[PDB]
Design an enzyme around this catalytic site. Sequence first.
Site, mmCIF file in Angstrom:
data_model
loop_
_atom_site.group_PDB
_atom_site.id
_atom_site.type_symbol
_atom_site.label_atom_id
_atom_site.label_comp_id
_atom_site.label_asym_id
_atom_site.label_seq_id
_atom_site.Cartn_x
_atom_site.Cartn_y
_atom_site.Cartn_z
ATOM 1 N N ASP A 1 35.078 50.737 38.318
ATOM 2 C CA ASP A 1 35.565 49.391 38.573
ATOM 3 C C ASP A 1 34.441 48.376 38.398
ATOM 4 O OD1 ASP A 1 36.777 47.056 39.476
ATOM 5 O OD2 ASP A 1 37.621 47.931 41.279
ATOM 6 N N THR A 2 34.372 47.796 37.192
ATOM 7 C CA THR A 2 33.375 46.768 36.856
ATOM 8 C C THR A 2 33.543 45.464 37.655
ATOM 9 O OG1 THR A 2 34.695 45.957 34.981
ATOM 10 C CG2 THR A 2 32.949 47.625 34.485
ATOM 11 N N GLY A 3 34.749 45.213 38.181
ATOM 12 C CA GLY A 3 35.005 44.041 39.004
ATOM 13 C C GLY A 3 34.636 44.189 40.476
HETATM 14 C C1 LIG Z 1 48.584 46.920 48.345
HETATM 15 C C2 LIG Z 1 48.357 48.122 47.429
HETATM 16 O O1 LIG Z 1 48.470 47.692 46.093
HETATM 17 P P1 LIG Z 1 47.845 48.536 44.851
HETATM 18 O O2 LIG Z 1 48.766 48.140 43.554
HETATM 19 C C3 LIG Z 1 46.113 47.973 44.532
HETATM 20 O O3 LIG Z 1 45.147 49.041 44.377
HETATM 21 C C4 LIG Z 1 43.962 48.513 43.963
HETATM 22 C C5 LIG Z 1 43.322 47.539 44.722
HETATM 23 C C6 LIG Z 1 42.116 46.977 44.303
HETATM 24 C C7 LIG Z 1 41.544 47.386 43.109
HETATM 25 C C8 LIG Z 1 40.215 46.782 42.632
HETATM 26 C C9 LIG Z 1 40.338 45.273 42.365
HETATM 27 N N1 LIG Z 1 41.451 45.072 41.443
HETATM 28 C C10 LIG Z 1 42.474 44.266 41.695
HETATM 29 O O4 LIG Z 1 42.584 43.605 42.728
HETATM 30 O O5 LIG Z 1 43.405 44.176 40.710
HETATM 31 C C11 LIG Z 1 44.651 43.566 41.049
HETATM 32 C C12 LIG Z 1 45.084 42.875 39.785
HETATM 33 O O6 LIG Z 1 45.581 43.925 38.923
HETATM 34 C C13 LIG Z 1 46.221 44.915 39.784
HETATM 35 O O7 LIG Z 1 45.717 46.243 39.453
HETATM 36 C C14 LIG Z 1 45.704 46.970 40.702
HETATM 37 C C15 LIG Z 1 45.138 45.961 41.691
HETATM 38 C C16 LIG Z 1 45.729 44.632 41.217
HETATM 39 C C17 LIG Z 1 39.083 44.679 41.717
HETATM 40 O O8 LIG Z 1 38.775 45.441 40.551
HETATM 41 C C18 LIG Z 1 37.867 44.703 42.636
HETATM 42 N N2 LIG Z 1 37.870 43.607 43.622
HETATM 43 C C19 LIG Z 1 38.993 42.683 43.418
HETATM 44 C C20 LIG Z 1 38.497 41.396 42.784
HETATM 45 C C21 LIG Z 1 37.613 40.605 43.732
HETATM 46 C C22 LIG Z 1 37.723 41.732 41.524
HETATM 47 S S1 LIG Z 1 37.985 44.263 45.106
HETATM 48 O O9 LIG Z 1 38.695 45.584 45.024
HETATM 49 O O10 LIG Z 1 38.752 43.331 46.008
HETATM 50 C C23 LIG Z 1 36.351 44.478 45.746
HETATM 51 C C24 LIG Z 1 35.682 45.687 45.591
HETATM 52 C C25 LIG Z 1 34.389 45.835 46.080
HETATM 53 C C26 LIG Z 1 33.761 44.777 46.728
HETATM 54 O O11 LIG Z 1 32.501 44.938 47.205
HETATM 55 C C27 LIG Z 1 32.249 44.107 48.339
HETATM 56 C C28 LIG Z 1 34.422 43.563 46.887
HETATM 57 C C29 LIG Z 1 35.714 43.419 46.395
HETATM 58 C C30 LIG Z 1 42.180 48.366 42.351
HETATM 59 C C31 LIG Z 1 43.379 48.927 42.771
HETATM 60 O O12 LIG Z 1 47.891 50.124 45.004
HETATM 61 C C32 LIG Z 1 47.836 50.910 43.806
HETATM 62 C C33 LIG Z 1 48.066 52.390 44.115
#
Ligand SMILES: CCOP(=O)(COc1ccc(C[C@H](NC(=O)O[C@H]2CO[C@H]3OCC[C@H]32)[C@H](O)CN(CC(C)C)S(=O)(=O)c2ccc(OC)cc2)cc1)OCC
Lengths: 100, 100
Positions: free
Chosen positions: A25-27
């Site tokens: 996860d590059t984000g």
């Molecule tokens: C409520 C359950 O729903 P879900 O659909 C989501 O499962 C996820 C959640 C988060 C991620 C990573 C973030 N991607 C994501 O949110 O993507 C969104 C948009 O596309 C969809 O793809 C799945 C998640 C939607 C993103 O890459 C990383 N950050 C988000 C953003 C600030 C970039 S983070 O995860 O909030 C984060 C990680 C580490 C940190 O270090 C402090 C801080 C923050 C992936 C999958 O369950 C699937 C089985």
Amino acid sequence: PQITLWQRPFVTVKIAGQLMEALLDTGADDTILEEEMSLPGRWTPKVVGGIGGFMKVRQYDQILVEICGHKVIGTVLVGPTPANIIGRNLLTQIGCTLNF
Amino acid sequence: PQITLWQRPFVTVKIAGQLMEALLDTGADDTILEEEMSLPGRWTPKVVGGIGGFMKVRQYDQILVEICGHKVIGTVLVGPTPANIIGRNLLTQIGCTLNF
Ligand SMILES: CCOP(=O)(COc1ccc(C[C@H](NC(=O)O[C@H]2CO[C@H]3OCC[C@H]32)[C@H](O)CN(CC(C)C)S(=O)(=O)c2ccc(OC)cc2)cc1)OCC
């Protein structure tokens, strides 16, 4: 390996004897593992922020992670994340780059 | 370009005459843009899930996005995201791979 992005970039990961799939996860700044992950030791309370808001996590320092066989060491966060996430803190240690 | 991950992978994007920086985000299925992005046309209600829960977004189809100068077209979501995010729906169109 070189991995395209038509599928979610899951790899098999081994941490403290446990196996799991995790998203490259590059984000993500930080690595976060599902709530059922049981890691031994002391930890410091922290909160992480994303889409949808904030969530509380346990911060574990100096954890050995085996990601596609590469051994890396770093901080791992544990908490109620929907997906195991390998963030840039560990991605940098496996020489991970984006190409386009 | 080949891009390492010691810093967040932001690129400059141009979407309907507006400029912004956006995260190249392999952990995102979908592309999402900050709440103040003004996109023209009709949309459908959707909700997106992540760390911290869910958030409500407008789904806009067939939006032209210029990412590091590559022209791509895809669905863009707009909503109260803390970061502009380029997800795999657009990343696959710029031939973006992960390498390690
Ligand atoms: C409520 C359950 O729903 P879900 O659909 C989501 O499962 C996820 C959640 C988060 C991620 C990573 C973030 N991607 C994501 O949110 O993507 C969104 C948009 O596309 C969809 O793809 C799945 C998640 C939607 C993103 O890459 C990383 N950050 C988000 C953003 C600030 C970039 S983070 O995860 O909030 C984060 C990680 C580490 C940190 O270090 C402090 C801080 C923050 C992936 C999958 O369950 C699937 C089985």
